[PDB]
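Supplementary Methods, section 5.1.

A reviewer requested that the exact input to the structure prediction be made available. We therefore reproduce it here, unchanged from the version used in the analyses.
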Amino acid sequence: STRVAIVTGAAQGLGASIALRLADDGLDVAVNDIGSKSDQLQQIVAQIQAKGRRALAVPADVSRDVDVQAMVAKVVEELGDLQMVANAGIVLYQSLADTQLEVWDRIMSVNLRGVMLCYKYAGVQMIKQGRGGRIIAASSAAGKKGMINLPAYSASKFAVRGITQSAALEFAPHNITVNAYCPGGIRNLPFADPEVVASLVSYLAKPEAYFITGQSILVDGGVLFD
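The structure derived from this sequence is encoded token-by-token as follows.
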């Protein structure tokens, strides 16, 4: 009766810290990233198995409908889905004056479309199981206050909040919460280790966090307030 998590963009940084914290929390974990970080994904898998948990690498492009559907199906087959962390994202700096559609669409394809497809296939699987669930996406400080030279990035992280609130309403009758984290300075502003984001995701993923839904929470050391 062990709960199962998927973490996307989990080869390093925030995603790896979230995956290893959920494993420490007692969850079995499937880690996703792009194919080229397959070796790093295997390292994360071995560290989760060293904690006595079950683990699976699921390389996939989260911007592709078929990839995300197959990724959730492979996790259901292998691990037996209670938490989805839609963490994959890219940051590119490019002014609006200098905006190239291929940068604009690439940011939207991973940061927003990827989140939507993870929200949809996790939700559909959790509705099927009838035991509720936890859906959590990476927003950003840039999703609460737009940033100079990050128009595409800012647009994509505001959009994550919009679909989080819409999804939280749609999935509430099935006892699935949908929340987002908005990190600030993660390694003169405050800065912190990625553990502080893993700590927040860990809390939102818990059974006792069932009454928090549609929320986007700032973990930035008090730079923005909501």
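Residues 4-219 form a domain with the Rossmann fold fold (CATH 3.40.50.720). These observations are discussed further in the main text.
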